[PDB]
Amino acid sequence: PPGLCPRCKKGYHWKSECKSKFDKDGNPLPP
Ligand SMILES: [Zn+2]
């Protein structure tokens, strides 16, 4: 589905589904 992770903004997925290491502002993708 069209859900551009507005958190990391490096892929489409849910925040909780964000499997990225870091996110915007280079934040540590929290659990
Ligand atoms: Zn993400």
Distance (angstroms) between ligand 1 centre and the Cα of 7 equals 5
For 16: left if phi > 0, alpha if psi spans -120 to 50, otherwise beta; the answer is alpha
Distance (angstroms) between ligand 1 centre and the Cα of 28 equals 11
Distance (angstroms) between ligand 1 centre and the Cα of 12 equals 7
- Which residue reads 């909780």 in tokens? 16
* CA–CA separation, 26 and 21 (whole Å): 9
Phi and psi angles of residue 24, each rounded to the nearest 5 degrees, phi first: -35, 150
Evaluated on CA atoms 19, 26, 4, 6, the torsion sign reads positive
Distance (angstroms) between ligand 1 centre and the Cα of 9 equals 6
For 1-31, the DSSP string reads ---B-TTT-SSBS-TTT---SEEGGGEE---
Tokens of 20: 């990225």
What technique determined this structure?
Answer: NMR
Tokens of 11: 């892929």
- Which residue reads 């659990």 in tokens? 31
* CA–CA separation, 9 and 2 (whole Å): 13
Query: Contact at 8 Å (CB) between 4 and 18?
Result: no
Evaluated on CA atoms 24, 27, 29, 31, the torsion sign reads negative
